[PDB]
Amino acid sequence: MMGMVFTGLMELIEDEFGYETLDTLLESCELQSEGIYTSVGSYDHQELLQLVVKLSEVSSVPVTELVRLFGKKLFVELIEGHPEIANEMKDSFDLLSKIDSFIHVEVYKLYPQAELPKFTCDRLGDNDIRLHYQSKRPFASFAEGLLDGCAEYFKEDFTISRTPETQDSETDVIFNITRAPRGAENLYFQ
Ligand code: HEM
Numbered sequence: 001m002m003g004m005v006f007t008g009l010m011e012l013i014e015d016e017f018g019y020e021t022l023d024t025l026l027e028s029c030e031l032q033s034e035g036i037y038t039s040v041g042s043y044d045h046q047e048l049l050q051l052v053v054k055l056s057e058v059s060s061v062p063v064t065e066l067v068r069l070f071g072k073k074l075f076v077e078l079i080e081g082h083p084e085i086a087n088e089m090k091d092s093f094d095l096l097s098k099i100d101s102f103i104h105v106e107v108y109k110l111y112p113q114a115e116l117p118k119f120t121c122d123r124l125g126d127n128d129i130r131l132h133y134q135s136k137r138p139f140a141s142f143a144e145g146l147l148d149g150c151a152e153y154f155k156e157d158f159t160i161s162r163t164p165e166t167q168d169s170e171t172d173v174i175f176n177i178t179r180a181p182r183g184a185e186n187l188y189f190q
Pocket residue numbers: 001078099103104107108111114115116135137139142146147150
């Protein structure tokens with residue numbers, strides 16, 4: 001995921017502010033080749049970061065506020081990119097129990113330039129679910145951008161939380177997904 005992440009980013013700055021602004025972004029990153037390929041490569045992580053820090057100084061958009069909105073655009077692009085991937089899904093909850101089984105397994109088999117960490121899923125009940133992610137590069141803001149984007153297309157109301165034990169720790173993060181009434185809050189505390 002790097003060639004199509006560039007596609008979403010180019011389309012976002014061109015429509016939101018202009019092509020002149022997109023021109024400045026291009027100037028910051030010198031391009032040896034054409035500069036716009038297709039999804040099939042695999043650049044560095046700093047490459048994406050360089051275009052992110054320029055987007056944080058050119059539009060004055062924070063790296064966290066931009067990571068949220070960016071998550072929404074690219075995720076719905078995949079929905080309109082794989083029509084039968086949407087048909088096979090039944091709900092966002094089922095989506096959580098399908099992410100590790102076939103979604104990232106089918107891609108891994110048909111795309112060897114990607115690598116994934118460990119994923120486990122415990123079930124506490126109906127209104128509580130737990131997702132454990134073991135990775136050395138855990139960005140909570142990025143994860144919320146993709147999970148909430150999915151709940152954006154469906155228009156549901158799920159809330160992704162986190163625990164304080166690994167709240168400020170890396171390598172392992174404990175997430176808590178809770179199904180709220182969808183129209184109630186401040187029922188208990190915290
Ligand atoms: C909400 C749905 C999904 C979740 C939560 C999810 C989550 C992830 C995570 C956590 C990463 C790596 C991010 C990181 O560790 O920093 C990732 C990467 C990737 N995802 Fe997804 N993904 C989802 C759906 C998709 C979809 C729709 C596609 C396409 C079929 C897809 C293709 C990939 C590929 C190939 C990677 C490899 C790792 C990378 O992005 O660098 N993902 N996904």
